[PDB]
């Protein structure tokens, strides 16, 4: 609810389906601990990663396995994965949508933070 | 239903609200005739532009008034507007979502064409 | 060189070579009058479109023939072209670099404006 | 120059000057070992990170300190940084240009890989 991920394919002009997404939370020893994961739906969205009670302020990394995605389509990719590292902040609005647009040699990611 | 437009603001990380959007259809004299328009909602989306019966194959231009949008926020923009010109094609899938990510000196546009 | 265009290929991770580019300048009647044209080089760059003396204040449109570029690669792209529209020199003479990153169903454009 | 980084500012339409860049190379243990570092110049480009002899096959991470760059401009950005992760030289020696386009809540990265 508080955190949603949406992936799109700029080569085929479609949602990016069954893309693996891992979210990590930065721990006090500065290592990344597993926090949430899932695979995008037919609409390229991944919902239900976390809840308001568990999504406390902190630094989060979301990993999008873009390489596996392009491999399964038979298209050489450049990147190992796409990356979005950010600070969740209770001051700001509290719904985070991380959207990624993927090409084999390029990606863009944007955050839409709303109520 | 067949044609949807979604605009996002990469400076504020939010949907781009009350953005004017004009769609034109290319006529046989190669001029652009008015086809549909509206303003994006609070969620940055613009729905109900056209229907399946009216959205025939042809070349369409969609105009996003990005300049007015940045002006009202007090931010100098570079572009007069953002532009997406494309051929609607009955062979391909038939729902078109045109998404635009806006920055003052840059924009990206992507088409997601589904069932 | 007051106006330079650089085009990259997001699918192949390379400059986009031999891409046709047409520039227009909006006249009184609000018709687009042919201004300058050329094709990108091996580096993806197009230099020599215009001169400081010829490139007066005005509203310019840079049309990048993205469709012919994807078609010669066997790809049926979404966009007919990428149009960049902007007011040039209106706060005085500037040097403009219009960069475009191309994918079959997506493109991004940015402007680097220096004094 | 086998590795070059270029950073642009989508808000100001200018190169992103003085942006810190750190490169790591994944070791056996799957830890990221410091590889090279520097800051972009007035042109937004960072040259001289490494040499042909030093830049062997491996998995590299290029971290661009986008947050410090937006903060010195008075902007509180979404991302902690922009990380680019890729396998280099695995089909033989290449020259790599990693380009990033920055906005406060968004970034795009592309790779131009030449032989
Ligand atoms: C919500 O976010 C996006 C949503 C959609 C859609 O909801 O079908 C498309 C693109 C979006 O993002 C992007 C637009 C341009 C570049 C990157 C993503
Ligand atoms: C070397 O590559 C780029 C170069 C320039 C420039 O030469 O001034 C601009 C954008 C570049 O890449 C980008 C293109 C679009 C989006 C992001 C970066």
Coordinates of C-alpha atoms and ligand atoms in Angstrom, one line a residue:
Chain A
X1 CA 0.0 0.0 0.0
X2 CA 2.7 2.4 1.0
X3 CA 5.2 1.2 -1.6
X4 CA 4.4 0.2 -5.1
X5 CA 6.7 -0.6 -8.1
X6 CA 5.7 -0.3 -11.8
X7 CA 7.9 -1.5 -14.7
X8 CA 7.5 -0.7 -18.4
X9 CA 9.3 -2.1 -21.5
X10 CA 10.3 0.7 -23.9
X11 CA 11.3 -1.8 -26.7
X12 CA 7.9 -3.6 -26.9
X13 CA 5.7 -0.7 -25.5
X14 CA 4.2 -2.8 -22.8
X15 CA 4.2 -3.5 -19.2
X16 CA 7.3 -5.4 -18.1
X17 CA 5.8 -8.7 -16.8
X18 CA 7.3 -11.2 -14.2
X19 CA 10.1 -9.0 -13.4
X20 CA 11.8 -9.8 -10.1
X21 CA 12.0 -7.0 -7.6
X22 CA 13.9 -7.1 -4.3
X23 CA 13.6 -4.4 -1.7
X24 CA 16.2 -4.1 1.1
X25 CA 16.5 -1.9 4.2
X26 CA 19.8 -0.5 5.3
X27 CA 20.7 -1.9 8.7
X28 CA 22.9 0.0 11.3
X29 CA 26.0 -2.0 10.2
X30 CA 25.4 -0.4 6.7
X31 CA 24.6 -3.7 5.1
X32 CA 21.4 -4.3 3.1
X33 CA 19.0 -6.7 4.7
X34 CA 16.1 -8.4 2.8
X35 CA 12.8 -6.3 3.4
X36 CA 10.3 -7.4 0.6
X37 CA 10.2 -8.9 -2.9
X38 CA 7.8 -10.2 -5.5
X39 CA 7.4 -10.3 -9.3
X40 CA 5.5 -7.7 -11.4
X41 CA 2.0 -8.6 -12.6
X42 CA 0.5 -8.7 -16.0
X43 CA 0.0 -5.0 -15.7
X44 CA 3.7 -4.6 -14.8
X45 CA 2.9 -3.6 -11.2
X46 CA 3.9 -5.0 -7.9
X47 CA 1.6 -4.3 -4.9
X48 CA 1.5 -5.5 -1.3
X49 CA 5.3 -5.2 -0.7
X50 CA 4.9 -3.8 2.8
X51 CA 2.5 -2.1 5.2
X52 CA 2.4 1.3 7.0
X53 CA 3.4 -0.3 10.3
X54 CA 6.5 -2.0 8.8
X55 CA 7.6 0.8 6.5
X56 CA 9.4 3.0 8.9
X57 CA 11.7 5.9 8.0
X58 CA 15.1 4.6 6.8
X59 CA 17.1 4.0 3.5
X60 CA 15.7 1.5 1.2
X61 CA 17.1 -0.1 -2.0
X62 CA 14.7 -1.6 -4.5
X63 CA 16.2 -4.1 -7.0
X64 CA 14.8 -4.6 -10.4
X65 CA 16.3 -7.8 -12.1
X66 CA 16.3 -6.2 -15.6
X67 CA 19.0 -8.6 -16.8
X68 CA 16.9 -11.7 -16.4
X69 CA 14.0 -9.9 -18.0
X70 CA 15.9 -9.0 -21.2
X71 CA 17.6 -12.5 -21.2
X72 CA 14.3 -14.3 -21.3
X73 CA 13.3 -12.2 -24.3
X74 CA 16.6 -13.0 -26.0
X75 CA 18.0 -9.4 -26.0
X76 CA 21.4 -8.5 -24.7
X77 CA 21.2 -6.1 -21.8
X78 CA 23.8 -3.8 -20.5
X79 CA 22.9 -3.5 -16.8
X80 CA 23.0 -6.2 -14.1
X81 CA 19.8 -4.7 -12.6
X82 CA 18.1 -1.3 -12.0
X83 CA 18.5 0.5 -8.8
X84 CA 16.6 2.9 -6.8
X85 CA 18.1 3.8 -3.4
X86 CA 16.1 6.4 -1.4
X87 CA 15.2 7.6 2.1
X88 CA 11.6 7.1 3.2
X89 CA 10.7 10.2 5.2
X90 CA 7.6 10.7 7.4
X91 CA 7.7 14.5 6.7
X92 CA 6.9 14.0 3.1
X93 CA 3.8 12.4 1.6
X94 CA 3.5 8.7 2.4
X95 CA 2.6 6.7 -0.7
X96 CA 5.7 5.8 -2.9
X97 CA 5.4 4.6 -6.5
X98 CA 8.7 3.7 -8.1
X99 CA 8.3 3.5 -11.8
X100 CA 11.1 2.2 -14.1
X101 CA 11.2 2.5 -17.9
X102 CA 13.5 -0.2 -19.4
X103 CA 15.6 -0.4 -22.6
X104 CA 18.4 -2.9 -23.1
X105 CA 21.1 -0.2 -22.7
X106 CA 19.2 2.4 -20.7
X107 CA 16.7 2.8 -17.9
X108 CA 14.9 5.7 -16.2
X109 CA 13.4 5.6 -12.8
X110 CA 11.1 8.1 -11.2
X111 CA 9.4 8.4 -7.8
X112 CA 5.8 9.6 -7.4
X113 CA 5.2 10.4 -3.8
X114 CA 1.6 11.2 -3.0
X115 CA -1.5 11.2 -0.6
Chain B
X1 CA -11.0 4.2 -23.1
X2 CA -8.9 3.5 -26.1
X3 CA -6.6 6.5 -25.4
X4 CA -5.3 7.6 -22.2
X5 CA -2.6 10.2 -21.2
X6 CA -0.7 10.3 -18.0
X7 CA 1.7 13.1 -17.0
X8 CA 4.3 13.1 -14.2
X9 CA 6.5 15.9 -12.7
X10 CA 10.1 14.8 -12.2
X11 CA 11.0 17.9 -10.2
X12 CA 8.4 17.5 -7.4
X13 CA 7.9 13.7 -7.8
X14 CA 4.1 14.0 -8.3
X15 CA 1.5 13.6 -10.8
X16 CA 1.4 16.7 -13.1
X17 CA -2.1 18.2 -12.4
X18 CA -4.3 20.4 -14.6
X19 CA -2.0 20.0 -17.6
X20 CA -3.7 20.9 -20.9
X21 CA -3.6 18.1 -23.5
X22 CA -4.8 18.5 -27.1
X23 CA -5.1 15.6 -29.5
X24 CA -5.3 16.1 -33.3
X25 CA -5.9 13.9 -36.2
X26 CA -4.0 14.3 -39.5
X27 CA -6.5 15.1 -42.3
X28 CA -5.9 14.2 -46.0
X29 CA -4.6 17.8 -46.7
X30 CA -1.9 17.0 -44.1
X31 CA -3.1 19.6 -41.6
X32 CA -3.9 18.7 -38.0
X33 CA -7.5 18.9 -37.1
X34 CA -8.8 19.1 -33.5
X35 CA -9.8 15.5 -32.3
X36 CA -10.0 15.7 -28.4
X37 CA -8.6 17.6 -25.4
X38 CA -8.9 17.9 -21.7
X39 CA -6.8 18.7 -18.6
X40 CA -5.1 16.0 -16.4
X41 CA -6.7 15.0 -13.1
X42 CA -5.4 15.1 -9.6
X43 CA -3.8 11.7 -10.4
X44 CA -2.2 13.2 -13.5
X45 CA -4.3 11.2 -15.8
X46 CA -6.7 12.2 -18.6
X47 CA -9.4 9.6 -19.5
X48 CA -12.4 9.7 -21.8
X49 CA -10.7 11.4 -24.7
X50 CA -12.3 9.3 -27.4
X51 CA -14.2 6.0 -28.0
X52 CA -13.5 2.9 -30.0
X53 CA -16.0 3.9 -32.8
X54 CA -14.3 7.3 -33.3
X55 CA -10.6 6.3 -32.9
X56 CA -10.0 4.9 -36.3
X57 CA -6.6 4.1 -37.8
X58 CA -4.7 7.3 -38.7
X59 CA -1.9 9.6 -37.5
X60 CA -2.5 11.4 -34.3
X61 CA -0.7 14.1 -32.4
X62 CA -1.1 14.6 -28.7
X63 CA -0.1 18.0 -27.3
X64 CA 1.0 18.4 -23.8
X65 CA 1.2 22.1 -22.7
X66 CA 4.3 21.7 -20.6
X67 CA 5.2 25.4 -20.8
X68 CA 2.0 26.6 -19.1
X69 CA 2.5 23.9 -16.5
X70 CA 6.0 25.1 -15.5
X71 CA 5.0 28.7 -15.8
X72 CA 2.3 28.4 -13.2
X73 CA 4.8 26.8 -10.8
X74 CA 7.3 29.7 -11.5
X75 CA 10.0 27.6 -13.2
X76 CA 11.5 28.4 -16.6
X77 CA 10.9 25.7 -19.1
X78 CA 12.7 25.0 -22.3
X79 CA 10.0 23.4 -24.5
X80 CA 6.9 25.1 -25.9
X81 CA 5.0 21.8 -25.3
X82 CA 5.7 17.9 -25.5
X83 CA 4.8 16.0 -28.5
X84 CA 3.8 12.6 -29.3
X85 CA 3.0 11.8 -32.9
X86 CA 2.1 8.3 -33.8
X87 CA 0.0 5.9 -36.1
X88 CA -3.0 4.2 -34.5
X89 CA -3.0 0.7 -36.0
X90 CA -5.7 -1.9 -35.8
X91 CA -3.2 -4.8 -36.3
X92 CA -1.5 -4.0 -32.9
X93 CA -3.2 -4.1 -29.5
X94 CA -5.9 -1.4 -29.1
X95 CA -5.5 0.4 -25.7
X96 CA -2.9 3.3 -25.9
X97 CA -1.5 4.9 -22.8
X98 CA 0.9 7.8 -23.5
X99 CA 2.9 8.6 -20.5
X100 CA 5.1 11.7 -20.2
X101 CA 7.7 12.5 -17.6
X102 CA 8.5 16.2 -17.4
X103 CA 11.5 18.2 -16.3
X104 CA 12.0 21.9 -17.1
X105 CA 14.7 21.1 -19.8
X106 CA 13.8 17.6 -20.6
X107 CA 10.9 15.2 -21.2
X108 CA 10.4 11.6 -22.0
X109 CA 7.4 10.0 -23.5
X110 CA 6.5 6.3 -23.7
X111 CA 3.6 4.4 -25.2
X112 CA 2.1 1.4 -23.5
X113 CA -0.1 -0.4 -26.0
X114 CA -2.1 -3.3 -24.5
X115 CA -5.3 -5.5 -24.2
Chain C
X1 CA 27.8 26.2 -33.6
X2 CA 24.7 27.7 -32.0
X3 CA 22.5 24.5 -32.6
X4 CA 23.8 20.9 -32.4
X5 CA 21.8 17.6 -32.3
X6 CA 23.0 14.4 -30.8
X7 CA 21.0 11.1 -31.0
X8 CA 21.6 7.9 -29.1
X9 CA 20.2 4.4 -29.5
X10 CA 18.9 2.9 -26.2
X11 CA 18.5 -0.6 -27.7
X12 CA 22.0 -1.0 -29.1
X13 CA 23.9 1.3 -26.7
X14 CA 25.4 3.3 -29.5
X15 CA 25.1 6.6 -31.3
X16 CA 22.2 6.7 -33.7
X17 CA 23.9 7.2 -37.1
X18 CA 22.4 8.6 -40.3
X19 CA 19.3 10.0 -38.5
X20 CA 17.6 12.7 -40.6
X21 CA 16.9 15.9 -38.8
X22 CA 14.7 18.8 -40.1
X23 CA 14.5 22.2 -38.4
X24 CA 11.6 24.7 -38.9
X25 CA 11.1 28.2 -37.6
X26 CA 7.5 29.4 -36.9
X27 CA 6.6 32.3 -39.3
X28 CA 4.0 35.1 -38.7
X29 CA 1.0 33.0 -39.9
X30 CA 1.9 30.3 -37.4
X31 CA 3.1 28.0 -40.2
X32 CA 6.4 26.2 -39.9
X33 CA 8.9 27.3 -42.4
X34 CA 11.8 25.1 -43.4
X35 CA 14.9 26.3 -41.6
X36 CA 17.8 23.8 -41.7
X37 CA 18.4 20.1 -42.2
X38 CA 21.0 17.4 -42.1
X39 CA 21.9 13.8 -40.8
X40 CA 23.7 12.6 -37.8
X41 CA 27.3 11.4 -38.1
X42 CA 29.1 8.2 -36.9
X43 CA 29.2 9.9 -33.5
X44 CA 25.4 10.4 -33.5
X45 CA 26.0 14.2 -33.7
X46 CA 24.8 16.7 -36.3
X47 CA 26.9 19.9 -36.5
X48 CA 26.6 22.9 -38.9
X49 CA 22.9 23.2 -39.1
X50 CA 23.0 27.0 -38.9
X51 CA 25.2 30.0 -38.0
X52 CA 25.1 32.7 -35.3
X53 CA 23.9 35.3 -37.9
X54 CA 21.1 33.1 -39.3
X55 CA 19.8 31.7 -36.0
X56 CA 17.8 34.6 -34.8
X57 CA 15.2 34.7 -32.0
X58 CA 12.2 32.6 -32.9
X59 CA 10.2 29.5 -32.1
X60 CA 12.0 26.5 -33.6
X61 CA 10.9 22.9 -34.2
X62 CA 13.5 20.1 -34.5
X63 CA 12.0 17.0 -36.1
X64 CA 14.1 13.9 -35.7
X65 CA 13.1 11.1 -38.1
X66 CA 13.1 8.3 -35.5
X67 CA 10.6 6.1 -37.5
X68 CA 13.0 5.7 -40.6
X69 CA 15.8 4.9 -38.2
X70 CA 13.9 2.0 -36.4
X71 CA 12.5 0.8 -39.7
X72 CA 15.9 0.3 -41.3
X73 CA 16.7 -1.8 -38.3
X74 CA 13.6 -4.0 -38.7
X75 CA 11.7 -2.5 -35.9
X76 CA 8.2 -1.0 -36.2
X77 CA 8.4 1.9 -33.7
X78 CA 5.5 3.8 -32.0
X79 CA 6.4 7.4 -32.9
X80 CA 6.3 9.0 -36.3
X81 CA 9.2 11.2 -35.2
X82 CA 10.5 13.0 -32.3
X83 CA 9.6 16.8 -32.4
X84 CA 11.4 19.3 -30.2
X85 CA 9.8 22.7 -30.0
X86 CA 11.3 25.7 -28.2
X87 CA 11.9 29.5 -28.2
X88 CA 15.5 30.2 -29.0
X89 CA 17.5 33.3 -28.1
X90 CA 14.7 35.2 -26.4
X91 CA 16.8 36.2 -23.4
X92 CA 19.8 36.7 -25.8
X93 CA 22.1 34.5 -27.9
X94 CA 22.7 30.9 -26.6
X95 CA 24.3 27.8 -27.7
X96 CA 21.8 24.8 -27.9
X97 CA 22.5 21.1 -27.8
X98 CA 19.3 19.0 -28.3
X99 CA 20.0 15.4 -27.3
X100 CA 17.5 12.5 -27.9
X101 CA 17.7 8.9 -26.6
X102 CA 15.6 6.6 -28.7
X103 CA 13.8 3.3 -28.1
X104 CA 11.1 1.7 -30.3
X105 CA 8.2 2.9 -28.1
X106 CA 9.8 5.7 -26.2
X107 CA 12.1 8.6 -26.4
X108 CA 13.6 11.2 -24.2
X109 CA 14.9 14.6 -25.1
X110 CA 17.0 17.0 -23.2
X111 CA 18.5 20.5 -23.9
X112 CA 21.9 21.8 -22.8
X113 CA 21.8 25.6 -23.1
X114 CA 25.0 27.4 -22.5
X115 CA 26.0 31.1 -22.7
Chain D
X1 CA 39.8 6.2 -22.0
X2 CA 37.9 2.9 -21.6
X3 CA 35.4 4.4 -19.0
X4 CA 33.9 8.0 -19.1
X5 CA 31.0 9.4 -17.2
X6 CA 28.8 12.3 -18.3
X7 CA 26.1 13.9 -16.1
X8 CA 23.5 16.4 -17.2
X9 CA 21.0 18.6 -15.2
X10 CA 17.4 18.3 -16.5
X11 CA 16.2 21.2 -14.3
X12 CA 18.8 23.8 -15.4
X13 CA 19.5 22.4 -18.9
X14 CA 23.2 22.3 -18.2
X15 CA 26.0 19.9 -17.5
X16 CA 26.1 18.7 -13.9
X17 CA 29.4 20.1 -12.6
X18 CA 31.4 18.8 -9.6
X19 CA 29.4 15.6 -9.2
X20 CA 31.3 13.0 -7.3
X21 CA 31.5 9.6 -8.9
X22 CA 32.8 6.4 -7.2
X23 CA 33.5 3.2 -9.1
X24 CA 33.6 -0.3 -7.5
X25 CA 34.5 -3.7 -8.8
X26 CA 32.8 -6.8 -7.4
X27 CA 35.4 -9.1 -5.7
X28 CA 35.1 -13.0 -5.1
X29 CA 33.1 -12.6 -1.9
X30 CA 30.6 -10.5 -3.7
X31 CA 31.7 -7.4 -1.8
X32 CA 32.2 -4.2 -3.8
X33 CA 35.8 -3.1 -3.7
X34 CA 36.8 0.5 -4.4
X35 CA 38.0 0.8 -8.0
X36 CA 38.2 4.4 -9.1
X37 CA 36.8 7.8 -8.3
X38 CA 36.6 11.5 -9.4
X39 CA 34.3 14.5 -10.1
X40 CA 32.7 15.7 -13.2
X41 CA 34.2 18.8 -15.0
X42 CA 32.6 22.1 -16.3
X43 CA 31.4 20.0 -19.3
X44 CA 29.7 17.5 -17.0
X45 CA 32.3 14.9 -18.0
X46 CA 34.7 12.8 -16.0
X47 CA 37.7 11.4 -17.8
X48 CA 40.7 9.4 -16.6
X49 CA 39.0 7.1 -14.2
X50 CA 41.0 4.1 -15.3
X51 CA 43.3 2.7 -17.9
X52 CA 43.0 -0.1 -20.5
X53 CA 45.4 -2.3 -18.5
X54 CA 43.6 -1.7 -15.2
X55 CA 40.0 -2.1 -16.4
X56 CA 39.8 -5.8 -16.7
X57 CA 36.7 -8.0 -17.1
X58 CA 34.5 -7.8 -14.1
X59 CA 31.2 -6.5 -12.7
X60 CA 31.4 -2.8 -12.0
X61 CA 29.2 -0.4 -10.0
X62 CA 29.3 3.4 -10.8
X63 CA 27.8 5.4 -8.1
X64 CA 26.9 9.0 -8.9
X65 CA 26.4 11.2 -5.9
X66 CA 23.2 12.8 -7.2
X67 CA 21.9 13.7 -3.6
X68 CA 24.9 16.0 -2.7
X69 CA 24.5 17.7 -6.1
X70 CA 20.8 18.5 -5.6
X71 CA 21.4 19.5 -1.9
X72 CA 24.0 22.2 -2.9
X73 CA 21.3 23.6 -5.1
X74 CA 18.7 23.7 -2.3
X75 CA 16.7 20.8 -3.5
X76 CA 15.8 17.8 -1.4
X77 CA 16.0 14.9 -4.0
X78 CA 14.4 11.4 -3.9
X79 CA 17.5 9.3 -4.6
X80 CA 20.5 8.7 -2.4
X81 CA 22.5 8.3 -5.6
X82 CA 22.4 6.9 -9.0
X83 CA 24.0 3.4 -9.2
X84 CA 25.0 1.9 -12.5
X85 CA 25.8 -1.8 -12.4
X86 CA 27.2 -3.7 -15.4
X87 CA 29.6 -6.5 -16.6
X88 CA 32.5 -4.9 -18.5
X89 CA 34.7 -6.4 -21.1
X90 CA 33.1 -9.9 -21.0
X91 CA 32.9 -10.3 -24.8
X92 CA 36.3 -8.5 -25.1
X93 CA 37.6 -4.9 -24.5
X94 CA 35.2 -2.0 -25.1
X95 CA 35.0 1.7 -24.5
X96 CA 32.2 2.7 -22.1
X97 CA 30.4 6.0 -21.7
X98 CA 27.9 6.1 -18.9
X99 CA 25.6 9.1 -19.2
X100 CA 23.1 10.2 -16.5
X101 CA 20.3 12.8 -16.8
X102 CA 19.3 14.1 -13.4
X103 CA 16.0 15.5 -11.9
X104 CA 15.2 15.8 -8.2
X105 CA 12.8 12.8 -8.3
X106 CA 14.0 11.0 -11.3
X107 CA 17.1 10.0 -13.3
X108 CA 17.8 8.2 -16.5
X109 CA 21.0 6.4 -17.4
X110 CA 22.3 5.2 -20.7
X111 CA 25.4 3.4 -21.9
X112 CA 27.3 4.0 -25.2
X113 CA 29.5 1.0 -25.8
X114 CA 31.9 1.1 -28.7
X115 CA 34.6 -1.2 -30.0
Ligands
LIG1 C1 3.3 5.8 -13.4 O1 4.4 5.9 -14.0 C2 4.2 5.6 -15.2 C3 3.1 5.0 -15.5 C4 2.8 4.6 -16.7 C5 1.4 3.9 -16.8 O2 1.0 4.0 -15.7 O3 1.0 3.1 -17.7 C6 3.6 4.8 -17.7 C7 4.7 5.4 -17.4 C8 5.0 5.8 -16.2 O4 6.1 6.2 -16.0 C9 7.0 6.7 -16.7 C10 6.9 7.6 -17.6 C11 8.1 8.0 -18.3 C12 9.3 7.5 -17.9 C13 9.4 6.6 -16.9 C14 8.2 6.1 -16.3
LIG2 C1 26.8 11.4 -24.3 O1 25.4 11.4 -24.1 C2 24.6 12.5 -24.0 C3 25.1 13.6 -24.3 C4 24.6 14.7 -24.2 C5 25.5 15.9 -24.7 O2 26.3 15.5 -25.4 O3 25.4 17.1 -24.5 C6 23.3 14.7 -23.8 C7 22.7 13.5 -23.4 C8 23.5 12.5 -23.5 O4 23.0 11.5 -23.2 C9 21.8 11.5 -22.8 C10 20.7 11.5 -23.7 C11 19.5 11.5 -23.2 C12 19.2 11.2 -22.0 C13 20.3 11.1 -21.2 C14 21.5 11.3 -21.5

